[PDB]
């Protein structure tokens, strides 16, 4: 959780955003990474190259 505060600092967002929204941000990462497994299974044309 200290690392992501260092990475919002690169894109011009201060550290206060992450700690004030630590639970909500973690849910967004958790749900988005679960969609990736379903996305490759549904569309077989992703692994074309």
């Amino acid at each position: 959780p200290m690392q992501m505060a260092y990475r919002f600092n690169g894109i011009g967002v201060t550290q206060n955003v992450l700690y004030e929204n630590q639970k909500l941000i973690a849910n967004q990462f958790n749900s988005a990474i679960g969609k990736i497994q379903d996305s490759l299974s549904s569309t077989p044309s992703a692994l074309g190259k």
Partner: protein
């Protein structure tokens, strides 16, 4: 921290500093941040005034 005294320091070279009011910025209260600890800051604008005026 080194166990007793808290310090603020830069990222790639160890150089501890005393946490004054100009070394930090304030955003919101302290009941929402996970892992926040208790400490005090030693501001340099109050006791400079207190030494001369009092």
């Amino acid at each position: 921290s080194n166990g007793t005294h808290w310090f603020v320091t830069q990222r790639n070279f160890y150089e501890p500093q005393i946490i004054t009011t100009d070394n930090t910025f304030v955003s919101g209260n302290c009941d929402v941040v996970i892992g926040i600890v208790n400490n005090t800051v030693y501001d340099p604008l109050q006791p400079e005034l207190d030494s001369f005026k009092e």
